[PDB]
Swiss-Prot record, chain A:
It holds the Pfam family Herpes_VP19C. It is found in: Virion; Host nucleus. Signal peptide: none annotated. This is Triplex capsid protein 1. InterPro entries: Herpes_1. Belongs to the herpesviridae TRX1 protein family. The gene is TRX1. The lineage of its organism: Viruses, Duplodnaviria, Heunggongvirae, Peploviricota, Herviviricetes.
Curated annotation (Swiss-Prot), chain B:
Belongs to the herpesviridae major capsid protein family. Homomultimer. Makes the hexons and eleven out of twelve pentons. Interacts with triplex proteins 1/TRX1 and 2/TRX2; adjacent capsomers are linked together in groups of three by triplexes, heterotrimeric complexes composed of one molecule of TRX1 and two molecules of TRX2. Interacts with scaffold protein; this interaction allows efficient MCP transport to the host nucleus. Interacts with capsid vertex component 2/CVC2. Interacts with the small capsomere-interacting protein/SCP. It comes from the Viruses. This is Major capsid protein.
UniProtKB/Swiss-Prot annotation, chain C:
The keyword Thylakoid does not apply. The keyword Transcription does not apply. One of its GO terms (molecular function) is structural molecule activity. Transmembrane segments: none annotated. GO terms for cellular component: host cell nucleus; viral capsid. It holds the Pfam family Herpes_V23. Keywords: Capsid protein, Host nucleus, Virion. This is Triplex capsid protein 2. Structural component of the T=16 icosahedral capsid. The capsid is composed of pentamers and hexamers of major capsid protein/MCP, which are linked together by heterotrimers called triplexes. These triplexes are formed by a single molecule of triplex protein 1/TRX1 and two copies of triplex protein 2/TRX2. Additionally, TRX1 is required for efficient transport of TRX2 to the nucleus, which is the site of capsid assembly. Interacts with TRX1 and major capisd protein/MCP.
């Protein structure tokens, strides 16, 4: 503790040589490896590697796509890492043309297992999922090892390019007519109740709204139909205890000027999707609501 | 040990061993500096009276 | 520059065999009552909140407010304890019973050791022990949290063999891993005070609302903008079978109620939700990204 010591400006790591260089300068040994500069040393993004079988790589080779775990029963396949697109076949929001279009693309036993494990359970869909973030750097082999962002920006190694979130156009929705300068992206599963099964309808709802109470208040606007159908099923069936009718989870944010249409291009199959461009991921959690 | 007399039991010698132990008790004082104070310490603007 | 920490010291002496037991927990959460800098071991850990009569909900309600903290580095005569920051990944040791897969949303809960002994005892020290909170996946917390509330509602009914058996079924959760039975809150034929107050918080909300909401729903259903409160007036009836050819055509509503007491019943409905709020909404405190082999360490991005 000296007066000068508090007076010193904070010292940024680039000003000091790399710790490996600090050892090699002291001991002077020279390996073949180029430790002169460390890659990935400036990354506020936090990441995790997920092994995903080759039957699920389609439409994920493009960087930027949700990873969602899916717990199913059987102890051998403890989980399975669904894309957002693969979940669209089950959704009721998706166009039948788009659904039959992309359903052909998932003609693999690994993906068809996902439809079977979706049908299998009585308990609601929103329970089985846990969003993991977004694809980047597809390992692209007999079994892709996808790198997935938990927080921060999606971008290339070396920050040479910014990966963009891609959301299939039928799921994308906007409540408001005058977009704000910044707006948050939320993923919204909404059960509409029906006799044989309560079919889910997925959406992704960008909005400048941040407050939870005001957000759910505006949400019950469009979802009054599903909410009233839940109330009607509540009285139609005794000793049936159906729970929440939409579920919202904060998915991240984008600047609302970045939003614009595009298409994914795979197996010569154009797919119209909205494209948040500099989409920083900041995961939230599913919030039950009526 | 004192030496004993006739018909009285004698005294066996007794080595004794013992041990002390140290005890810890640290101290701490906080002192704080406003950022407005630090920013004039290191940054310096247009040098004016 | 040095990482910010919280030094901790042991008033009672430490054995060479004792300090080796801390190197095992060097990467484990250690909850602290209050952010400070120097801390005696007495204020360390959850053991200060042990009680005889007070139960699981006391621990849960005080545990919500304690400052989570990892152990950082044993010094022999000292212990560092880093306070996690939101949005940076910290490794944690797997004190919880259940194995964590990657992507799980963990949360902290009081320890829930059951009767027959397993590995529990580590750091007896001067009639004092370092109890550590369970770290458990979110759904298992949602399930344990209800098992206790139902055994509390059954605490009044242990004469019946059917309840006597159903309690045993709630007692032993069956999870996707080795199973861990849950200790019964009831003891000595009599329920502990915390679960009793929480069950009152639930049953007041279950009963005070039924007699109260009709005076308001009858008036709101007139407007029709929402278009479901008329359907909700039938939902009020709480009938299970289809109505007989008898009394019910409208829900029962309170009569004549004296002008002011209606405010007191209304506000007492809202006072019970506040007692219930500690159990209503569990909150994530970690989100594990990758797990070590043997599911022993995990590296979770901190939340909160």
């Amino acid at each position: 503790m000296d007066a000068r010591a508090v007076a010193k400006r904070p010292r940024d790591p680039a000003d000091e040589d790399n710790e490996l260089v600090t050892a090699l300068k002291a001991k002077r040994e020279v390996n073949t490896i180029s430790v002169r500069y460390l890659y990935h040393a400036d990354h506020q993004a936090l990441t995790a590697r997920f092994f995903v079988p080759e039957g699920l790589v389609e439409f994920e080779a493009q960087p930027g796509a949700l990873l969602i775990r899916m717990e199913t029963g059987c102890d051998s396949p403890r989980h399975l890492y669904i894309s957002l697109y693969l979940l669209g076949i089950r959704a009721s929001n998706v166009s039948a043309s788009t659904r039959c279009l992309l359903e052909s693309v998932y003609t693999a036993s690994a993906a068809r297992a996902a439809l079977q494990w979706l049908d299998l359970g009585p308990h609601l869909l929103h329970r089985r999922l846990e969003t993991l973030g977004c694809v980047k750097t597809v390992s692209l082999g007999i079994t892709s090892l996808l790198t997935c962002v938990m927080r921060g920006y999606l971008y290339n190694t070396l920050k040479t390019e910014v990966f963009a979130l891609m959301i299939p156009k039928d799921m994308y929705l906007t409540w408001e007519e005058t977009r704000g300068r910044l707006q948050y992206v939320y993923l919204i599963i909404v059960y509409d109740y029906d006799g044989p099964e309560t079919r889910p309808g997925i959406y992704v709802l960008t909005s400048s709204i941040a407050h939870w109470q005001t957000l759910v208040d505006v949400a019950r606007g469009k979802f009054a139909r599903e909410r009233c159908s839940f109330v009607n099923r509540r009285i139609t069936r005794p000793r049936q205890i159906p729970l929440c009718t939409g579920v919202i989870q904060k998915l991240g944010w984008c600047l609302a000027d970045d939003i614009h249409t595009s298409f994914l291009v795979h197996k010569e199959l154009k797919l119209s999707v909205v494209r948040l461009d500099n989409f920083s991921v900041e995961l939230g959690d599913f919030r039950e609501f009526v | 040990r004192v030496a004993s007399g006739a018909g009285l039991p004698t005294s066996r010698q007794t080595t004794i061993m013992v041990t002390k132990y140290s005890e810890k008790s640290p101290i701490t004082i906080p002192f704080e500096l406003s950022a407005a104070c630090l920013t004039y310490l290191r940054e310096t603007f247009e040098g004016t009276i | 520059a040095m990482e910010a920490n919280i030094f901790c010291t042991f008033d009672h002496k430490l054995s060479i065999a004792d300090v080796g037991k801390l190197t095992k927990l060097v990467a484990a959460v250690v909850p602290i009552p209050q952010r400070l800098h120097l801390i005696k071991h007495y204020q360390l850990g959850l053991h200060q909140f042990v009680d005889h009569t007070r139960g699981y909900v006391r621990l849960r309600g005080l545990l919500r407010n304690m400052t989570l903290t990892l152990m950082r580095r044993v010094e022999g005569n000292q212990i560092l304890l880093h306070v996690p920051t939101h949005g940076l990944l910290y490794t944690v040791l797997n004190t919880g019973p259940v194995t964590w897969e990657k992507g799980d949303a963990l949360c902290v809960l009081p320890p829930l050791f059951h009767g027959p002994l397993a590995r529990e005892n580590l750091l007896t020290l001067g009639q004092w022990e370092l109890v550590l909170p369970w770290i458990v996946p979110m759904p298992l917390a949602l399930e344990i949290n209800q098992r206790l509330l139902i055994m509390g509602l059954f605490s009044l009914d242990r004469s019946y063999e059917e309840v006597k058996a159903a309690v045993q079924q709630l007692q032993t959760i069956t999870f996707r891993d080795a199973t861990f039975t849950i200790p019964d809150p009831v003891i000595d034929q009599h329920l502990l005070i915390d679960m009793k107050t929480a069950c009152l918080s639930m049953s007041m909300v279950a009963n005070l609302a039924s007699e109260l909401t009709m005076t308001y729903v009858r008036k709101l259903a007139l407007e029709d903008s929402s278009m479901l409160l008329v359907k909700c007036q039938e939902l009020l009836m709480r009938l299970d079978r289809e109505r007989s050819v008898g009394e019910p055509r409208t829900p029962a509503r309170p009569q004549h109620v004296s002008p002011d007491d209606e405010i007191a019943r209304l506000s007492a409905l809202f006072v019970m939700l506040r007692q219930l709020d500690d159990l209503i909404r569990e909150q994530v405190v970690f989100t594990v990204c990758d797990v070590s082999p043997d599911n022993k360490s995990a590296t979770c991005i901190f939340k909160g």
